[PDB]
Design a protein around this nucleic acid. Structure first.
Ligand code: MG
Ligand code: MG
Ligand code: MG
Ligand code: MG
Ligand code: MG
Ligand code: MG
Ligand code: MG
Ligand code: MG
Ligand code: MG
Ligand code: MG
Ligand code: MG
Ligand code: MG
Ligand code: MG
Ligand code: MG
Ligand code: MG
Ligand code: MG
Ligand code: MG
Ligand code: MG
Ligand code: MG
Ligand code: MG
Ligand code: MG
Ligand code: MG
Ligand code: MG
Ligand code: MG
Ligand code: MG
Ligand code: MG
Ligand code: MG
Ligand code: MG
Ligand code: MG
Ligand code: MG
Ligand code: MG
Ligand code: MG
Ligand code: MG
Ligand code: MG
Ligand code: MG
Ligand code: MG
Ligand code: MG
Ligand code: MG
Ligand code: MG
Ligand code: MG
Ligand code: MG
Ligand code: MG
Ligand code: MG
Ligand code: MG
Ligand code: MG
Ligand code: MG
Ligand code: MG
Ligand code: MG
Ligand code: MG
Ligand code: MG
Ligand code: MG
Ligand code: MG
Ligand code: MG
Ligand code: MG
Ligand code: MG
Ligand code: MG
Ligand code: MG
Lengths: 134, 259, 158
RNA sequence: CGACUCUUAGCGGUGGAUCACUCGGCUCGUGCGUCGAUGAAGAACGCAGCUAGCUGCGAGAAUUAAUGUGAAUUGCAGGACACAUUGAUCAUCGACACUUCGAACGCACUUGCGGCCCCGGGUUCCUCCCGGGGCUACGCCUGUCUGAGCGUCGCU
RNA sequence: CCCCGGAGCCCCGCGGACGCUACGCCGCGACGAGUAGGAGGGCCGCUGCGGUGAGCCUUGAAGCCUAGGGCGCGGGCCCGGGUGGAGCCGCCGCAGGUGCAGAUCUUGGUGGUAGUAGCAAAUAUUCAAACGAGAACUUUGAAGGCCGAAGUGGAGAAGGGUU
RNA sequence: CGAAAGACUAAUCGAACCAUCUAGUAGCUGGUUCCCUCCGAAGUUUCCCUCAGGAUAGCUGGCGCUCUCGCACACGCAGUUU
RNA sequence: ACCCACCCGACCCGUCUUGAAACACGGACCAAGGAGUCUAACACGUGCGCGAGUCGGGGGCUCGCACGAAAGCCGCCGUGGCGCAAUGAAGGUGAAGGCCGGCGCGCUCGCCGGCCGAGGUGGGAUCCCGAGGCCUCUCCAGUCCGCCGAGGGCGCACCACCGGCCCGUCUCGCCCGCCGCGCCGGGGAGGUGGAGCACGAGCGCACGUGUUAGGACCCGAAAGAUGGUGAACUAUGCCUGGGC
RNA sequence: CGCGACCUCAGAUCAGACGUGGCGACCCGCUGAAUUUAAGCAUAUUAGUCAGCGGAGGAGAAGAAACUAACCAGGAUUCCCUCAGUAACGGCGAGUGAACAGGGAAGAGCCCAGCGCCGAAUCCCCGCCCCGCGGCGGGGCGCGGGACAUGUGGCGUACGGAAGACCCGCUCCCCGGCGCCGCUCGUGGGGGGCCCAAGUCCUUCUGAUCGAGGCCCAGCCCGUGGACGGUGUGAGGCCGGUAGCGGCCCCCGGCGCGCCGGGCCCGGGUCUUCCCGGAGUCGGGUUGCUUGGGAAUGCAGCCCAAAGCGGGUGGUAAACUCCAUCUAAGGCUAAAUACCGGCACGAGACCGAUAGUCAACAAGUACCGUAAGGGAAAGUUGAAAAGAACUUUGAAGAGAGAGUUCAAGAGGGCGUGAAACCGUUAAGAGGUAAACGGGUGGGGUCCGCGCAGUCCGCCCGGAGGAUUCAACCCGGCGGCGGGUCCGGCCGUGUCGGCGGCCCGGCGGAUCUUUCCCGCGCGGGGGACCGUCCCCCGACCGGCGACCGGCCGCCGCCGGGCGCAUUUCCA
């Protein structure tokens, strides 16, 4: 259960919170898991997906073991566009098909300074909890 | 329903003589809502017949002995495998029905322990059946935060939380009670009498101190004892084919004289 | 119209009463709020009784109640004078004082002096500074209790 | 058989019931309990690269600064930026800013007429002229200055 | 002059239904109009809640439609097929904004009336051409007509507000 | 307001219009939602500023209780008659 | 169950009405909506708990309430309500009687010892006792078991009647009492008013029906009241223009 | 005829301050109806209610007795429960209607004028310096102004107070700063930020899964987390969250210690001598409203108009008289209490687009009205726009093919798509309008058959074929039932232990203060009674409350038995 008497557990409230979410908050919502490989290395479950990570689509039609680079992040549409994840429209023009970030797995991160410091913060909290549990 | 609901219009009846129908009709304007039908419980817009009030007598208060009588009745039938099995609880492989346990079970701080306990005691197959029942609710309570529904599980009466109520918490189905604060809403859910519980020896000792035996007061509920029984020999089959009674009955006329 | 036997009864629902119906959906929320606020006040007045001040014993008025005895509002001045507590100080040690109480009979007076005497015996006046001057009790009766007294202080039992 | 009419069924229309959804209501509760001449509420008129409405803002006008965040915004354009840099975008909001009416204040409501001090062009204080700036409501209190009275006195 | 773990049974007292949800099951008689009105029973029906069905459901829920198959005195119900595309029901309790043909009822929709009434105030149109997919109606030219300077002309006021 | 018609006062005048008191009151019209089963009326009484309504008797239903004995072994009651 | 045929039957519903197929009203058709509710108070019935009691509110103690604004507990458990006592306008008064023996004159009156203790008549479900049968494969003896049972009893509830007691009231009477002897206080007999007593039945909770007060089954006036908006139409006055 | 004091008055765009409007759920002061009820109506009622005006605050108002009472007396205000639908009012009709006591929530008490003493000992504003400065303050210094004796400040206010003499005991309280230490209850106060568990494992459905079985180890992992939401269906483990006395960073609060700057020489009792109270107010008369308040509950106007052992109250007018009880005509005060407005949250046996707010949407919008005001309708393609390229007919709208989609029998007002009503297709009928009830017939539509439906099941007789038995013993296991209650555990009624009784506790208006402790009372012992527990023996219900042996019976497994048996099959 949730016991904190200031959170909500109220369909209408959670959905309204979700759909009318502000960009910086959507960043967090649009997170996606690391590959087991990276999960081992960084000590982090998942990361906020970003403009030019390398990525697999895990479920759907485009479900496949190819590793496409991310193309853009349409936070309004809760979606990311990926390199070869696309479909030919009526008149031949390719159109980047949206995939939801959570149905995707990050194989290669785009590491900047800030992304580096984020991963350092998440790994540290994870190991504090393991120390507290032990 | 709101006070102003339905009456926020100003609407007069065009009286008789206009054909139409003597309802109050919205006054003036160049809209669809003009010369309509206000206030009447029948009209669109309108005003529900006998709008519901807040001061409906919601709460309902019950005599204290009666409340206790119910709670004794539920306890008494938490024994009786038949009444527990009939109430659905898969209590087939459980070792003894007023199921009482060691008081390390106060100790446990992890679900891990609490589940392992339930599997040794063979009470897990109730929890298993709780998982099996988890399904979506029928209809409008879905859109009002009652979306999922399931079974009631094993009760677990404890005497003191030394950690226990944390341990049994995520195990779906389980409700934990204090002995000193029992509740008929939980001991007889659905107003239905049986329910598999799991006692802690510390708690299971305390019951007689709480409720008082037949020749001893409550000694904890000031002025109380058990309710006395109306009839003692419940098995009437043992009565009716006794020597004493069948001695004194005419022989049963049983021929069938048809027309 | 009345029909065959019944109390010819007068209800008072002729004014606009539904405009002034007062529901009680508060009450649980209220009861808690008081209770929190109560526990806070205890914690603020740290070793002082949660109760309040000590209050006198007092008989009720009228032939009806007469026989019973309650807590009164505060100890009279004569009762403080005889006990030998300066009225302005008595407030500072948790002794209720009203000054509007007469004192008719000497049976009610000596009882209420006895009360204050007893209070002063079983009271633990802390010194102003941790450095200990006169009046202020020993650090023994201080360490062994900086304890609050639950319930009414020296309760009256008829 | 013929047309037409009636009945039933199939399929198609018309129409939007039903069912299923719900970023809305309705009710009960909790905490706090804050507007204004330092110009409120309300109104007006403005402001977007393409924008009418809703919203958001005020000639610094879909916002400036700051702090937090850490790559977008995205209908299309265009762009920026080096996202190893105060740094996109959101959020917060303490600095800055805040057109005109409005208690509404120079007097009027035409958006009309003014007065008084200072500044720039205009002069070379020559007042004009133009532009900018600052004052110019009523009531009232504490003081201040100037006064009034065959009001009550004193000295001359 | 004996025992039913065996008389063999139309009566069996040694143990007892195929039957016994004892709110069950069974037998005999009698009777059955009904407004207003009253009461009982509804395994009749609607929506939500506590229980409960190791219920049902993308291998197809609800709803909808059906010259298909049935049940019930009836309220109603169950199955088949179609359509649909995401939830829904049985039982035990509790709860109610719970069942429509009518209210010159309310809101929305649709007919017959009906291709009917009707498109009749103020004399008037015709020929050719152009454009154009297309001309009774546009435009140009030609003719014939009217308003007849108290104008069907030429300019404002108010009002409109971009005409 | 009226050279007077109760005329006119924004299609409204023998008392304008708007919002509220207001869901104003109504012994009077109208309507009042599923099935089966069982029982089943009254339009007469007295009183009433009562006569298109109430009250009160009556007539109806429901709940019962107390007894009775077809369990070879009955008292009481009647829209009769003697 | 779809269509068609034929014989017989068969006027359109709703409604008010003594009477509706009516030349009585409402109704073109379909969908959705649409009217005996809730609160309070009373009464009776029924179900449950406890019972001369019962009671829960209000308050408090136990939790951040996930379920909890629940659940539990309280010398508050009873301040208090209702109930356990009436009757009188009130001052007030306030439900026991009998018997026996003795002492006062047994005076159907006054005082002292013992015994019983809510009176009696009729009817009363039911219990109880029970003469006597009625047999047993024989003549008698003879405990055991029934079945019935004439006859006789205790008699619940309830009903009818008669007694009795309490309060009010009247009438008539004769005695008692003492810190205060008094315009003091107390009793008796016989009527008569009382929503009385005569070995208790209530309290709380729940459902039902009925009756009310509330918008009170739903729809409906003509009116009434408070506070505001309009003389752009029109009525009349005035100012300033125009026209014949 | 001047100059100077003061008094009363003006004027300043004089210096510096304040007030004005809004909101209005709650609150305070006025004002104040009528529908309505009374079955009519006028008093009454509706109601001191709606509308009207005024003014506030986070609450307001009230409040420290000119009180209750009549007691063995209580002791500010507010709130709840009760008092109580009571006392009372009332065309004594309809109807209306309090208070004290009692129990709670809370709890807090104070200050002037006066009377007096103190060189006005007081206040405001200037100006210079040091600190402090986003709630203009401290300290110092100025012959720098003014207020003030027509009275400022200290002491002091009815609970008495002052001044005096000696009885006693001793001396911390406040603020302006500047630091510093412990982050100080939802279990680290408040705010902000950023963080923290476990499967996309197998197979298999599916357009997509989130669905269904599965995952040896005791049960895939995690589980203080199986709330909720999102993600192409239904997800504890995909993502955000959720749990946690979990983490880190900011900021702010609140309280603890140190230093400085100031202020501050601040008691009590005892005896004496003094001191003491709010006027056009009380009170009366009155008229009008108001109240349950009745020969006047409260408020008013007008007239009269006080006193000081007085005055007020003491619920029936007055006189006499005793008692009781307060101390009016000046003021401040947190708390429990209220809250349909606001900001910010949480929840629901509520509504689910004719509902729920007028308003799920560009709604107080469009639109109407001169104006006050009135006031709608209107949600849904799909998982994704993949929103139909291209070919062709047409001036075009419209089509026909093609394509996308799981589907366009989802085509931009597009989920589902009822009925009325219409078009057509098929079938059937047709001069008494249609339609209907009952009864048959004919035709259709499908549905069940049968390409014999002769339907099964027992038992038996015969005829074929095939496995191991049953019957019996033997060994093992399990179950039932039984009495000898045999032996022991188990418990009901009784009796014995007075044995638990102090190693058995509660309760008691039983007793005792021979006791103890604390102040005749409280607490604890100590007797006593009632109730609940140990020891063994005896009798009895030997009770479903169990064990152990023995018996009898049953069943299963395995041993035995090979075939006139016991099965299977046709
Ligand atoms: Mg509505
Ligand atoms: Mg449904
Ligand atoms: Mg208290
Ligand atoms: Mg058709
Ligand atoms: Mg619609
Ligand atoms: Mg019948
Ligand atoms: Mg009927
Ligand atoms: Mg869907
Ligand atoms: Mg409802
Ligand atoms: Mg209809
Ligand atoms: Mg024509
Ligand atoms: Mg022109
Ligand atoms: Mg009129
Ligand atoms: Mg109505
Ligand atoms: Mg009438
Ligand atoms: Mg009957
Ligand atoms: Mg009539
Ligand atoms: Mg007639
Ligand atoms: Mg008819
Ligand atoms: Mg006729
Ligand atoms: Mg009519
Ligand atoms: Mg008609
Ligand atoms: Mg309907
Ligand atoms: Mg009853
Ligand atoms: Mg009645
Ligand atoms: Mg009603
Ligand atoms: Mg009306
Ligand atoms: Mg009138
Ligand atoms: Mg104001
Ligand atoms: Mg009337
Ligand atoms: Mg009437
Ligand atoms: Mg009238
Ligand atoms: Mg009144
Ligand atoms: Mg008002
Ligand atoms: Mg105040
Ligand atoms: Mg006062
Ligand atoms: Mg009081
Ligand atoms: Mg009462
Ligand atoms: Mg009144
Ligand atoms: Mg003075
Ligand atoms: Mg989930
Ligand atoms: Mg989901
Ligand atoms: Mg996670
Ligand atoms: Mg009055
Ligand atoms: Mg008197
Ligand atoms: Mg005040
Ligand atoms: Mg809609
Ligand atoms: Mg709709
Ligand atoms: Mg709506
Ligand atoms: Mg819909
Ligand atoms: Mg739609
Ligand atoms: Mg729809
Ligand atoms: Mg489809
Ligand atoms: Mg579709
Ligand atoms: Mg559609
Ligand atoms: Mg849809
Ligand atoms: Mg045909």
């Amino acid at each position: 259960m949730k016991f904190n008497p200031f959170v909500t557990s109220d369909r209408s409230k959670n959905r309204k919170r979700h759909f009318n979410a502000p960009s910086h908050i959507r960043r967090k919502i649009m997170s996606s898991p690391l590959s087991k490989e990276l999960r081992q290395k960084y000590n982090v479950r998942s990361m906020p997906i970003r403009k030019d990570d390398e990525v697999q689509v895990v479920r759907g039609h485009y479900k496949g073991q190819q590793i496409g680079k991310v193309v853009q992040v349409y936070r309004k549409k809760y979606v990311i566009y990926i390199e070869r994840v696309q479909r030919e429209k009526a008149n031949g023009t390719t159109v980047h098909v949206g995939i939801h970030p959570s149905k995707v797995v990050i194989t290669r991160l785009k590491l900047d300074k800030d992304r580096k410091k984020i991963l350092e913060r998440k790994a540290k909290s994870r190991q504090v909890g393991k120390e507290k549990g032990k | 329903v709101s006070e102003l609901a339905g009456h926020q219009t100003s609407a007069e009846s065009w009286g008789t003589g206009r054909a139409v129908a003597r309802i109050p009709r919205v006054r003036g304007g160049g809209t669809h809502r003009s010369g309509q039908g206000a206030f009447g419980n029948m009209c669109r817009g309108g005003r529900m017949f006998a709008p519901t009030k807040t001061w409906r007598r919601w709460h309902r208060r019950v005599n204290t002995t009666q409340k206790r009588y119910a709670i004794c009745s539920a306890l008494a039938a938490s024994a009786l495998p038949a009444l527990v099995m009939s109430k659905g609880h898969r209590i087939e492989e459980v070792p003894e029905l007023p199921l009482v346990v060691e008081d390390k079970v106060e100790g446990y701080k992890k679900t891990k322990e609490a589940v392992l306990l339930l599997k040794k005691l063979k009470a897990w197959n109730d929890i298993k059946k709780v998982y099996a029942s988890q399904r979506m609710r029928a209809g409008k309570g879905k859109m009002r935060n009652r979306r999922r529904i399931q079974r009631r599980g094993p009760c677990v009466i404890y005497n003191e939380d030394n950690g226990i109520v944390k341990a049994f918490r995520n195990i779906p189905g389980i409700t934990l009670l204090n002995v000193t604060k029992l509740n008929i809403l939980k001991l007889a859910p659905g107003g239905h009498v049986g329910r598999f519980c799991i006692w802690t020896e510390s708690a299971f000792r305390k019951l007689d101190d709480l409720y008082g035996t037949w020749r001893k007061a409550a000694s904890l509920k000031s002025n109380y004892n058990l309710p006395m029984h109306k009839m003692l020999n419940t098995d009437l089959s043992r009565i009716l084919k006794s020597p004493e009674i069948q001695r004194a009955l005419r022989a049963p006329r049983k021929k069938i004289h048809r027309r | 119209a009345p029909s065959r036997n019944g109390m010819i009864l007068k209800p008072h629902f002729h004014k606009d009463w539904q405009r002034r119906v007062a529901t009680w959906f508060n009450q649980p929320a209220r009861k808690i709020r008081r209770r929190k606020a109560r526990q806070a006040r205890a914690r603020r007045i740290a070793p002082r009784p949660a109760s309040g001040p000590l209050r006198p014993i007092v008989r009720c008025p009228t032939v009806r109640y007469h026989t019973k005895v309650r807590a009164g509002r505060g100890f009279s001045l004569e009762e403080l004078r005889v006990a030998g507590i300066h009225k302005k100080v008595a407030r500072t040690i948790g002794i209720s004082v009203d000054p509007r109480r007469r004192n008719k009979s000497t049976e009610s007076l000596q009882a209420n002096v006895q009360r204050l005497k007893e209070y002063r015996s079983k009271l633990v006046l802390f010194p102003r500074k941790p450095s200990a001057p006169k009046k202020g009790d020993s650090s023994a009766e201080e360490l062994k209790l900086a304890t609050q007294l639950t319930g009414p202080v020296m309760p009256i039992r008829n």
